[PDB]
Design a protein around this ligand. Structure first.
Ligand SMILES: CC(C)Oc1c(NC(=O)c2ccc(NC(=O)[C@H](Cc3c[nH]nn3)NC(=O)c3ccc(NC(=O)c4ccc(C#N)cc4)cn3)cn2)ccc(C(=O)Nc2ccc(C(=O)O)cc2)c1O
Ligand SMILES: [Mg+2]
Ligand SMILES: [Mg+2]
Lengths: 517, 402, 517, 402
DNA sequence: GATTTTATGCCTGATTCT
DNA sequence: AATCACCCGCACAGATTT
DNA sequence: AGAATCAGGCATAA
DNA sequence: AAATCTGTGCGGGT
C-alpha cells in the first residue's frame, strides 16, 4: 500500500489527458486538414478495395474493420464521423458516396449501421494519390501490429476547401469552406511570385463559399480574419417580397437559409413568436418545400408593410446569424494560429517534398529493371552455348557458378549499348567490377538466376523485339527523371501542370453572394 | 438501482468499488467475495462539481446515488464523517487516458465535497495489469510497458546465449547482460534527441574512433576524420540523401561541420560538432560504449543459442536474431479495457486481498492542492491554457537524459 | 376483394408453419447430428480461415457474416447458439474455443457481442474433413447467391457423443451425451458382425456419460431406452457425511451436482426450505467453491442424524432429478423414432459414401497430372528439334500449330510408357486419336501449351530425374485407388484404420458412475 | 400505446392496420393517408387465448391494448358489437412462415372472442408482393413463386424463338408455347414423384417408345426393351454409375427387375417394372409427349433468336440458352420482409384504396370451423399430431398422374 | 429492432442584480 | 448493454376441489 | 439603465 | 383422500 500525494496524481493525469486530446482528437493538420479519425477511415476504406466504380458495401463492415484494426475507440463516434462526410449540406465537396437514408436538413437522423451503404467518392482518390511509391512516412498502430500513414499525400488544398470545426482542451478551431477554383488560382499566383501580400491574394479569393448558398453581409470582417486570423462575419437569408396585385396583399417568400440551421425549429420559433404578440403583421405561415426546392411562404396582414415586418425578422428570428472565424492548426505537432499565406506556403512545401520523393523512387525502379533487361538480352544473343553448357550441368548451383565465372561475347547487341553508355543506367549499388568492361559482358549472381528462369516461349521473334523496345523507352524515361531532379524550375512546372489539371477536372461555380452593409 | 450490497453490517470491514462501464461492473459482480464487498458501476463520464452549481449537483443521478450509498450528509450543517459506511473506497478505472480523466473528476468530487474522507485515508486507487504473457507452463501478468521490456530482455538472454568471438570464449550471462543494458540505455538517450541532429550521425560515431580533441589542435587530421565519416555515411546510404563536409580555422582549434541534403529537397545550413558537443558527456559515454563495441568480431563468429547456431558479424544482428528466436513459444494478450477480462482474472488481479496492489491517497499541503484544483478544474480558460503551455514540450526539454 | 373461407386459410397457414418448423429449426439430422443453425455457423467460421492455431476474431465478425450471408434470422438466436457451444459444462466435447465471460455454472450471464472472442476447436476440424474433394452436396441459400452444404462429411459420431434437445410442433427430441471411446468400440464391433444384438452392443456401451459427472441411480430404464427408443433415468448428486468426534458433530459435503442444475438456485431453495421450517435438522449452509473444485457445506443439529436429513434433501430439493430419454431424428426428410443399431448403421453408411466419393476425386486428379507429365517427359527427349522449330517460327501460335502438326518419336523414354497397364493412366475424356499410337506420340493442344512454358532450369539432371520419380509414384497411387474401388473389403479396412486413429487421437476417460438402486 | 389515431370521426369510413414489427410500423406511419387510416405496430408474437385462462388474458399488455383500441367490451354481459370503431380491419403480416403463424393467432382471437365482427365481414387480409423485377423501363412486382415462374416462361418466348428444325419450318408462337407449357407440366409431374424413382430413368423413358406389351413374350421380346434402355442409360453418365438388368415371369406377364448402383457398395436389388406401371396414365402421357419429342433435329438445326443463332442438338441445352438470353438484361430483387419497402412503395402497393388487393374473411360452416379450431389450437398434443401426420407427404403423394 | 446523461471552448439571446 | 414477453412439448413439485 | 449571470447548440470521446 | 388443476424450466424463433 504505497502512499501517493494528491497533487502529483492530479497534475500528471490531467496533463496526460490534455496533451492526448490536443494532439490526437480535436485540432486538424495544416498540410491536409484531416483529424486522425478521418485519415484512418479513408485509409481503411482504401485498403479493402472500395473504389468509386465498384459495388457498395454495408457501413457495418467498414466500421467494424476500422475499429478492429486501427482506431481503438467506440462505434457510435466512428459511424457519426462517417455519416457527417456523406451529407451534401454539410461539406462543400463530399468525400463519401452513400446510399440509404443519411438524414435531411429538416432535422432528421440517419438510419442504423446495418441499413446504409457507402463507397469512396471520386474526389477522395485525389487525396490518396501516389500513396504506394514511398511518398510519406508510416507509424505503428496501438498494439504494434500494423502501419498507418503519418499524413496523406494530398493533391487538393483540403483545409481551406472543406474547413473544419473542433473543441480541444484550452483552445478551439473554426474555419469555413471556400471555392476550389479560387483557391487554385491563389496557389498559382503565389507560385508565380513569393512576395505577394494579402491584397494580391484577396483578388483571387474574395471570400467564403458555403454549401447552402446564403448571402454574406459586410466585407471588413473577412479582411480582418484573413489578416490577423480571427474575425466575425454575418450570414443573412435570401428573402423576397412579392405581390400579385388584385387585392394588393403582399407575401414574403424565403428560398435559402444560413449555414447550420434547422428548418423545423426555425418555423416553430416563428410560430411561437407570433403567438405571443411579439411580431405584428403575420397572418399565415406555410411550407411548400418538397422535391423542387425550398420555399417558405409568409402571408402578412392587410394593413401592414412588408419591409417593416421583414426587417424585424432578421433582428428577432434566426434568419441572420453571426459566424466567428478562428483559425488554429498543427504546424509541426504543436498548435498555432494561421493566416492565409502561411497555409498556402505550407501546402506548396508539402507538394515539393512529395514530388521529390516520388521522382527518386521511380528512378531507382527504372534502373533496377534496366539491369535485368540487359542481362536477358545478352543471354538471348548467345542462346546455343548457354543451353549447351546447361545440359551438362549436374545441378542448378553449378550451372550458375559456371555462368558467373566466365565472360561472354556481346555480338550484335553491343551497338544498342552504345546508345546506353555514359553510366546512365548502372545502379548505384553496383560495383565497377561487373558490367561491360572491354566488349565482354560480366554477369552477377542475380543476373544468372534471372537467366535460369527464362521460358522457351520467349525464343520467338516478337518476344525478342519487345525487350529491345522496352529497353529503348526505359532509357528515355531515366533521362527525363534525371532532368526533373537536375533543376528547380522543372519541379515547379510539374506542380503547375498538376494544379491546372486538377482545376479543370474538379472545378465548379460560386454559390454565396457577398455584399457590403 | 445499480448497487450490489454486501452482507457485512459493521462499518469497519466493508469495501466499495467504483467500476467504469456497465459490462465491467457486471463481470465484477460475479467474481467477488460477496461477504464484505460492494459494487457500483458508472455508465460514463460524471458531473464536474467545481464548475457546476449546488442545485444541479443535487438534481443529477450518479452523484445522488453515490451520496446515498456513502450515507454521510452533503453540504454544510449536515456533513458528518462519523456516520460513514464502507470505510474503504477503491476507484479501479480503465488503463487509458479517459480512465485518468474520470479518476481526476472523482478526486475533485471527493476533495471538494468531503475533505475529511480524503485526509483520514479512506480512499484508494487500484492498478489493474495490462499485458498477459503465457509460455506454455509459465503464465504471468505484466504492468505497463517498461516491465514488458524488462521481461523481454530477461527471456531473450534466458539460458544458452554463450557468445563465441573467434573459436570458443564464453561471456556467460552477466557480462552480456551489462552490455545489453548499457546499449539499450544509450539507444534510449539517442532516441530523445533526434530533433537536433540525425539519427544516422549519432549511430555512426560509435564505431569510428574517438575524435581526441586534446591532441587534435590544428593537425589538419579533422579533414581526414570528416572525410572518413562522410564516406562511411554515403557508402551504405539508402535514402537518396547526400553529404558534404566543410572546415575552417576561425579559432585555435579547427572547426568543421557537415552539410546534408535530404529527401525533402531543402538543405540545412550545417550540423556543427562544436566545442559543446565534443565536451558534452553524451559523446564521452558514447565513446566509452563504442570502445567495447569496436570490431570485436573476427572473420569467423557465431551466436550459441540453445540447440541452435547461426554465424553473425554484428551486434545488432545478434540482438535481433535472439529476440526473434525467443518469441517462438510465447503468447501475449493485450487488454483494451476491463471488459476483456473474465471474473477469475479480475478476482486474482485486483480484488483478492492477498495479491492485489493499491495506492493510498494523502494530502501534503492544503493551500497548494487548493490552488492547483482551482487552476486546473476551474472555469477560467486563460490560466489553464497558460499552465498547459508551461508544461508543454518546451519545458520537457531536459538536458540530463540520465 | 375476393372471399375466402376461414377453415381453408387456417388449415393451410398452420400446416405450412408446422412443416417448416419440424424440418427447419428443431429436429436434428441423424447422420451428423446438427441443426441447420449449427451447420451454417460452422461453415461460415470455416470459410473465413478461422482455424484452431491462429489469432481470435471478435464475435461481431462471425455473427454479422452469418446473418448477412447464409442465415436470415435474428442475431440474438445466433449469438446464443454460439455461446452455448463454448461452455465446458454443456457439451461433452466443445466445438468452439472462446475467450471472455461465457458464463459460469451458476447460470449467471454472458457478456455482449463486442466483449468476447472465438475460434474453432481442434475437434471441430474432424467434422469438416475432406470438404473440398466433392464429398457432399451443396444447395442454394435464401436468395440464390451462395451455396451451403446439405450435410457435413463428419468423421466423429457427433449425435451420440454430444446429444441433442429440441422442441417442435407436435413432437420433441431429447438425447443425452455419451463417451467417445465406448461408441468407437461399438462401431468397430458392429463392423465385424452386422447381426449383433443389443445385449452385444451394450457390453461396449454401458450407458450415458454427462459433463458434470453425477451418479446415475438405476440400470433398468437404460436398456428399455436403447431397445425401444423411450425411457427414463434418475440422476443423483454426490455427497457424503463426515464426523469429527470431539462433540459428535456432523457435516454434509456436496461435490458434484446433476446435469442442468443451477448452484445458486439450489442454495437459495435450501435456504428457503430451512427458513419455512419444512426441513428439520439443518443449522447452517455455506459455499466454499474456489477455483479448484465444488464444495457446499451443510451443518446439522446435535439432536439429528445425517442420513435422515440427507434422504429428505434427495426427496425434496433438486439434488436428485429425472431425465426422460426420447430419441427422434430425421432420416430422409421425415421424423422417425430410432434405437441404437439404426443410428450406428446410418453412421457407417455415411462413411462408406464419403470414402467412395473421395476416392473417385483423387483418381481423377492423379490421372490428369500423369497425363501432363507424360507430355513433359516426351518433350524433354527431343530438345534439339524442338528448339530449332521454336526458333524458326515467328509467333507462339504458329509454333503451337507446328508442334501439334506432326508426331514425335518416343526415343529412349519408351520403357516406362509401355510398362503402364494399357489404359490405366489414360483420362476418360481423351479421344483415341491422341496418346501413344503405333510407335509415335501425338500431342494435344494443352500438352503443347505446357511444353511452351517449360523453363531452362529443367534441363539439369536432378530436375530431369524428379519428373520421372513423380510419374512412377503416380502410377502406384492410381493402382492403389483402383484396388480400393474394386473390392468391397478394402473399404472396411480403410474405415477401421480411420476410426482407430480417431480413437487414439481424441480418447478420454469416463466421468459418470452407474450403480444399482 | 403505439397507436396513431386518424381524423375521421365517423366509424363507417375508417380503417385500422395491425402491422408486424416496429420497422414496418414506422414505415406505415410515415406513408399513410393521414385522414382515415390508423396504425398499431405489434412487438412480436401474442398470447394464445385458446389455451390461456380468461384471467390471464386481461393482465397481458398486447391484447389489452388491442381491446382498448377496438373500443368494444370483452366477455359475456359486457360485449356490445354495435358500439364499434374502425369498421374495416386489415392484418398485413409478413410474407414468411412466422407471419402466417401470427395471422393464425390473430384469427383465433377474433373468432373466439368477437364472433359477430368476423361474421358480418369486418376482417380483411392484405397481400403485399414478394419479388420486384426491373428491365430498365418496364418494372413490376410479382407475388408468389408460381407467378414468377410463369413470368419467366412467358419472357423466354417474348418474340423471336422461330425454331428452324431441318430446312425451314416455323412453329410461330402458339404451337411452341403449347409445347413448352406441356413440357413444363410434365417436368412438374416428374418432380412431384421424384422420390420413388431415379431422375435419369424417368428422363430417359420419355425418349424411348411405348412399352409395346402386345408383342411381349418370355423370350426374344422381353429382353430387347430392357437391354435398349440399359444401353441408352449406361453410355450417358458422369458420376461413375452403373445400370444392370434381369427379367422374370409369373405365368401372367414377363416382368423386368432393373437395378442401378452409384457411389455405394450396397444394391437396391429391384426396381420392378410390371403391368402396374404400364397401366398407369403417367407413362401414357409421357409416351404421348415423347411421340412429339423425337429426333426431329437433322444434321442442321438452329433457333432464329433475335439477331442470334445457336445451332446445337439436345434441345434442353437450347432451352438453357434461351433462358440465358432472356436473363441478359433482367434484374430481380427479393424482399426479406416488410421493412425493406420504403414508405412510398408501401403506400402504392397495399395501402392505396385504388391500387391495393385484399381478401375478405367469411365463415361457411360453423360446426366444422369450431371442430377445426379445437383440434389444431387446443392443448391436446395427440389429435394435433394425428392431424399433421394424416396430411403429411403421404397425402400429398396423389396418384392421379394429372 | 429500440433503450440514456456528462466533459471541452466560444458565440448568441434572454433574464436578473444595484 | 443484456434485457423485454409471448409460441411449442414433456415431466414433476405443490395447491385446490370431489 | 446597464452590468452580471444563466441556458442552448456546434463536433469526437465515455 | 383421491382426483383434477396450476406454475416452472430446458433451446431456436418474432
Ligand atoms: C458490431 C458492429 C459494431 O461492428 C462489426 C464488427 N465489429 C467488430 O469487429 C468489433 C468492433 C468493436 C469492438 N470493440 C471492443 O471489443 C471494445 C472492448 C472494450 C472493453 N472495454 N472498452 N471497450 N469495445 C469498444 O470499443 C467500446 C467502447 C466504448 C463503448 N461505449 C461507450 O463508451 C458508451 C457510449 C455511450 C454511452 C452513453 N450515454 C455510454 C457508454 C462501446 N464499445 C469489437 N469488435 C465486425 C463485423 C461487422 C460486420 O461485418 N457486420 C455486418 C456486415 C454486413 C451485414 C449484412 O450483410 O447485412 C451484416 C453485418 C460489424 O458490423
Ligand atoms: Mg478505453
Ligand atoms: Mg421474417
Amino acid at each position: 500500500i504505497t502512499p501517493v500525494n494528491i497533487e502529483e496524481e492530479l497534475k500528471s493525469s490531467y496533463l496526460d489527458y490534455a496533451m492526448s486530446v490536443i494532439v490526437g482528437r480535436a485540432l486538424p493538420d495544416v498540410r491536409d486538414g484531416l483529424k486522425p479519425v478521418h485519415r484512418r477511415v479513408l485509409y481503411a476504406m482504401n485498403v479493402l478495395g472500395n473504389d468509386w466504380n465498384k459495388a457498395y458495401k454495408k457501413s457495418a463492415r467498414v466500421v467494424g474493420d476500422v475499429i478492429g484494426k486501427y482506431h481503438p475507440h467506440g462505434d457510435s463516434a466512428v459511424y457519426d464521423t462517417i455519416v457527417r462526410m456523406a451529407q451534401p449540406f454539410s461539406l462543400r465537396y463530399m468525400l463519401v458516396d452513400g446510399q440509404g437514408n443519411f438524414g435531411s436538413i429538416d432535422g432528421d437522423s440517419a438510419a442504423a449501421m446495418r441499413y446504409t451503404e457507402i463507397r469512396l467518392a471520386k474526389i477522395a482518390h485525389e487525396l490518396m494519390a501516389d500513396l504506394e511509391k514511398e511518398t510519406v512516412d508510416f507509424v505503428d498502430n496501438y498494439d504494434g501490429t500494423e502501419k498507418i500513414p503519418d499524413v496523406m499525400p494530398t493533391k487538393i488544398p483540403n483545409l481551406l476547401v472543406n474547413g473544419s470545426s473542433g473543441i480541444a482542451v484550452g483552445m478551439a478551431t473554426n474555419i469555413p469552406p471556400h471555392n476550389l477554383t479560387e483557391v487554385i488560382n491563389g496557389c498559382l499566383a503565389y507560385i508565380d511570385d513569393e512576395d505577394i501580400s494579402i491584397e494580391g491574394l484577396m483578388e483571387h479569393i474574395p471570400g467564403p463559399d458555403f454549401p447552402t448558398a446564403a448571402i454574406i453581409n459586410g466585407r471588413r470582417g473577412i479582411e480582418e480574419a484573413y489578416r490577423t486570423g480571427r474575425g466575425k462575419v454575418y450570414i443573412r437569408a435570401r428573402a423576397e417580397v412579392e405581390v400579385d396585385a388584385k387585392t394588393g396583399r403582399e407575401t414574403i417568400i424565403v428560398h435559402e437559409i444560413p449555414y447550420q440551421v434547422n428548418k423545423a425549429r426555425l418555423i416553430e420559433k416563428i410560430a411561437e413568436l407570433v403567438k405571443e404578440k411579439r411580431v405584428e403583421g403575420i397572418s399565415a405561415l406555410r411550407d411548400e418545400s418538397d422535391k423542387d426546392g425550398m420555399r417558405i411562404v409568409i402571408e402578412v396582414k392587410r394593413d401592414a408593410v412588408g419591409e417593416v415586418v421583414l426587417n424585424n425578422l432578421y433582428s428577432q428570428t434566426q434568419l441572420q446569424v453571426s459566424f466567428g472565424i478562428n483559425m488554429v492548426a498543427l504546424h509541426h505537432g504543436q498548435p498555432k494560429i494561421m493566416n492565409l499565406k502561411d497555409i498556402i506556403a505550407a501546402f506548396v512545401r508539402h507538394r515539393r517534398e512529395v514530388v521529390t520523393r516520388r521522382t527518386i523512387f521511380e528512378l531507382r525502379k527504372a534502373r533496377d529493371r534496366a539491369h535485368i533487361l540487359e542481362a536477358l538480352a545478352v543471354a538471348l544473343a548467345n542462346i546455343d552455348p548457354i543451353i549447351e553448357l546447361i545440359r551438362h550441368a549436374p545441378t542448378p548451383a553449378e550451372a550458375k557458378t559456371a555462368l558467373v565465372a566466365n565472360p561472354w561475347q556481346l555480338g550484335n547487341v553491343a551497338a544498342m549499348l552504345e546508345r546506353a553508355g555514359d553510366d546512365a543506367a548502372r545502379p548505384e549499388w553496383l560495383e565497377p567490377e561487373f558490367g561491360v568492361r572491354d566488349g565482354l559482358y560480366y554477369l552477377t549472381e542475380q543476373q544468372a538466376q534471372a537467366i535460369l528462369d527464362l521460358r522457351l516461349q520467349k525464343l520467338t521473334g516478337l518476344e525478342h523485339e519487345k525487350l529491345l523496345d522496352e529497353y529503348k523507352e526505359l532509357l528515355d524515361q531515366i533521362a527525363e527523371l534525371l532532368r526533373i531532379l537536375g533543376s528547380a524550375d522543372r519541379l515547379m512546372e510539374v506542380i503547375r501542370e498538376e494544379l491546372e489539371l486538377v482545376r479543370e477536372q474538379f472545378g465548379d461555380k460560386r454559390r454565396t453572394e457577398i455584399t457590403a452593409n | 438501482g445499480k448497487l450490489a450490497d454486501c452482507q457485512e453490517r459493521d462499518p469497519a470491514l466493508s469495501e466499495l468499488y467504483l467500476v467504469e462501464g456497465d459490462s465491467a461492473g457486471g463481470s465484477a459482480k460475479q467474481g467477488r467475495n460477496r461477504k464484505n464487498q460492494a459494487i457500483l458501476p458508472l455508465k460514463g463520464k460524471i458531473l464536474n462539481v467545481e464548475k457546476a452549481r449546488f442545485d444541479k449537483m443535487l438534481s443529477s443521478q450518479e452523484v445522488a446515488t453515490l451520496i446515498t450509498a456513502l450515507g454521510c450528509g452533503i453540504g454544510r450543517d449536515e456533513y458528518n464523517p462519523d456516520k460513514l459506511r464502507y470505510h474503504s473506497i477503491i476507484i479501479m478505472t480503465d488503463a487509458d487516458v479517459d480512465g485518468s480523466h474520470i479518476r481526476t473528476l472523482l478526486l475533485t468530487f471527493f476533495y471538494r465535497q468531503m475533505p475529511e474522507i480524503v485526509e483520514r485515508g479512506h480512499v484508494y486507487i487500484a492498478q489493474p495489469p495490462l499485458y498477459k504473457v503465457k509460455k506454455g507452463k509459465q503464465e504471468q501478468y505484466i504492468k505497463d510497458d517498461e516491465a514488458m521490456d524488462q521481461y523481454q530482455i530477461s527471456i531473450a538472454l534466458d539460458g544458452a546465449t554463450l557468445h563465441t568471438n573467434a573459436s570458443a570464449p564464453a561471456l556467460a550471462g552477466e557480462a552480456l547482460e551489462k552490455l545489453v543494458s548499457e546499449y539499450n540505455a544509450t539507444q534510449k538517450m539517442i532516441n530523445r534527441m533526434e530533433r537536433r541532429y540525425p539519427k544516422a550521425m549519432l549511430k555512426e560515431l560509435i564505431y569510428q574512433p574517438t575524435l581526441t580533441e586534446a591532441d587534435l589542435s590544428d593537425e589538419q587530421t579533422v579533414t581526414r576524420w570528416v572525410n572518413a565519416l562522410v564516406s562511411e555515411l554515403n557508402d551504405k546510404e539508402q535514402h537518396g540523401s547526400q553529404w558534404k563536409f566543410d572546415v575552417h580555422t576561425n579559432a585555435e582549434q579547427n572547426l568543421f561541420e557537415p552539410i546534408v541534403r535530404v529527401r525533402t529537397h531543402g538543405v540545412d545550413t550545417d550540423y556543427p560538432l562544436d566545442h559543446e558537443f565534443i565536451t558534452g558527456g553524451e559523446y564521452r559515454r558514447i565513446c566509452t560504449l563504442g570502445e567495447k563495441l569496436r570490431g570485436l568480431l573476427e572473420e569467423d563468429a557465431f551466436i550459441e543459442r540453445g540447440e541452435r547456431r547461426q554465424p553473425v558479424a554484428s551486434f545488432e544482428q545478434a540482438l535481433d536474431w535472439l529476440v526473434k528466436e525467443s518469441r517462438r513459444g510465447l503468447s501475449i494478450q493485450r487488454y483494451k479495457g476491463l471488459g476483456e477480462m473474465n471474473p477469475e482474472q479480475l478476482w486474482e488481479t485486483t480484488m483478492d486481498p492477498e495479491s492485489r496492489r493499491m495506492l493510498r491517497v494523502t494530502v501534503k499541503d492544503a493551500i497548494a492542492a487548493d490552488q492547483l484544483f482551482t487552476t486546473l478544474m476551474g472555469d477560467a480558460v486563460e490560466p489553464r491554457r497558460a499552465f498547459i503551455e508551461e508544461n508543454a514540450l518546451k519545458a520537457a526539454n531536459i538536458d540530463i537524459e540520465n
